[PDB]
């Protein structure tokens with residue numbers, strides 16, 4: 001079922017997104033969490049409408065994530081726990097070193113705030 | 120039936136509440152209190168439609184919905200609602216996620232979209248049930 | 252607010268530094284050394300604005316930034332800076348990220364445009380922070 | 384070898400030439416802030432490219448995840464991919480980058496002058512060690 005469900009996600013995403021570069025499957029894998037990267041940012045509404053289209057096709061709640069507008073923390077959560085379903089490897093590595101290194105700088109930026117909240 | 124008339128009345132009450140709290144939309148995007156009330160009443164509509172949908176499938180033995188979206192699929196498969204109407208209501212099933220998580224700016228343009236172009240889908244759904 | 256007085260001085264010193272190196276723009280697009288200095292000080296302005304933003308976020312417990320752009324939305328979410336001002340500073344964070352992290356070929360035409368029509372956002376930011 | 388490694392190595396070598404070209408001999412360096420700004424930027428471009436190369440190897444062979452930039456060079460050293468003194472030298476380069484970018488400490492220009500003279504080889508060593516593997 002997982003392999004069949006995975007393909008159905010590939011079809012819907014490749015068919016509704018131009019210049020698709022990466023398809024990721026993070027979170028718990030019910031409840032499905034999917035992240036994608038294209039050459040352009042996705043429209044806020046059009047992405048959500050597609051997530052509900054995925055949600056209707058797989059009969060599960062689906063969260064579609066635009067890696068071009070997603071937060072740096074969320075992007076690190078994808079490169080940490082995640083399954084690359086589609087896309088080249090050079091684009092995968094390009095996105096991993098882009099996010100991990102961005103995350104390392106951010107970790108230095110906000111360490112003062114994190115320590116205040118954690119007493 | 121008492122439970123149907125109450126859920127239908129609840130949907131009508133929450134649409135009135137969403138319209139009043141949102142106003143013309145000028146101060147919605149800037150007042151978290153206005154956003155919370157609109158988001159909350161939007162949730163009450165979703166569960167009330169899901170309750171109505173599961174009731175009809177139970178009263179007419181249409182099937183056993185394994186999911187909330189599947190309950191709308193059964194109503195359309197027996198041609199009680201049009202397939203484009205179920206798709207719009209199934210879009211609302213995912214709207215339950217926006218309230219439990221306070222990612223404000225991400226899906227604030229989304230709640231604005233559903234308040235402008237999707238409240239009528241609730242009005243259509245209760246209309247079909249009133250005909251019955 | 253002791254560290255803020257110093258970072259405001261850093262922004263004011265780097266803006267003067269950017270203006271002096273660019274001059275009139277005659278040799279900018281042809282002198283790599285002049286571009287390097289302008290790009291560096293433009294980054295120093297971004298880094299200094301983020302420090303002021305995160306200091307206020309710690310001194311007022313506004314939240315936890317999930318990105319560098321998030322530090323300016325928190326000020327805007329609490330209506331401490333204007334929503335268009337945060338969007339313009341968040342546009343500077345994008346320029347800073349392309350220069351620091353090499354995930355896109357740096358567009359010089361943007362940098363020329365930003366020195367001409369966007370340095371005022373830093374002057375705007377330091378004035379808005381000076382009030383409160 | 385990798386597609387990302389050959390590009391960052393090319394970026395480091397391009398920036399090493401730029402640092403050497405701007406720092407001709409130091410005649411006008413200590414007096415020209417513009418020359419100082421240009422050297423600092425390319426020194427950063429070298430640092431970030433080494434940090435990017437370091438983070439790729441740590442992920443591409445499952446050696447852990449570094450929480451900081453310095454831990455990336457630490458991980459490369461604990462797994463004997465770079466020498467312990469070379470990792471220590473690259474981590475002290477990040478400190479020079481941070482002090483020069485957003486100053487939480489007054490920039491000692493005699494350190495930047497010293498690094499162009501006796502420390503550019505640490506970048507050359509790094510790409511050479513990475514080029515072997």
Ligand SMILES: *P(=O)(O)OC[C@H]1O[C@@H](n2cnc3c(N)ncnc32)[C@H](O)[C@@H]1OP(=O)(O)OC[C@H]1O[C@@H](n2cnc3c(N)ncnc32)[C@H](O)[C@@H]1OP(=O)(O)OC[C@H]1O[C@@H](n2cnc3c(N)ncnc32)[C@H](O)[C@@H]1O
Pocket residue numbers: 037041067068069095098341342343344345346348349354355356357358359360361364365
């Ligand atoms: P980082 O993750 O911080 O995101 C920056 C940028 O990159 C995209 N992105 C995200 N993830 C990516 C991966 N994995 N790969 C590749 N690209 C990725 C993001 O979507 C984001 O794009 P945005 O357009 O949202 O960024 C907004 C601001 O970023 C700066 N910026 C973007 N591309 C740049 C390049 N190539 N070089 C330098 N700087 C870049 C800009 O500051 C931009 O602001 P703005 O353009 O909205 O406003 C500034 C001002 O500049 C003028 N202008 C825009 N474009 C121009 C061209 N082509 N020529 C002349 N003038 C231009 C406009 O007047 C505008 O108002």
Ligand SMILES: *P(=O)(O)OC[C@H]1O[C@@H](n2cnc3c(N)ncnc32)[C@H](O)[C@@H]1OP(=O)(O)OC[C@H]1O[C@@H](n2cnc3c(N)ncnc32)[C@H](O)[C@@H]1OP(=O)(O)OC[C@H]1O[C@@H](n2cnc3c(N)ncnc32)[C@H](O)[C@@H]1O
Pocket residue numbers: 474475476477478479481482488489490491492493494495497498
């Ligand atoms: P950030 O935390 O990101 O990094 C800065 C650095 O500073 C430490 N640190 C944290 N909190 C501190 C407080 N409160 N006070 C002082 N220092 C603090 C952090 O631990 C962090 O890491 P390191 O200490 O490992 O970084 C060391 C390298 O940082 C650069 N650096 C340090 N102070 C600087 C000033 N004032 N201005 C510019 N740059 C500075 C240096 O690159 C330093 O490397 P190094 O000193 O170990 O060796 C480099 C190289 O330069 C020669 N050299 C040293 N001193 C010289 C003078 N006076 N003249 C010429 N040449 C000199 C050395 O011989 C060696 O070859």
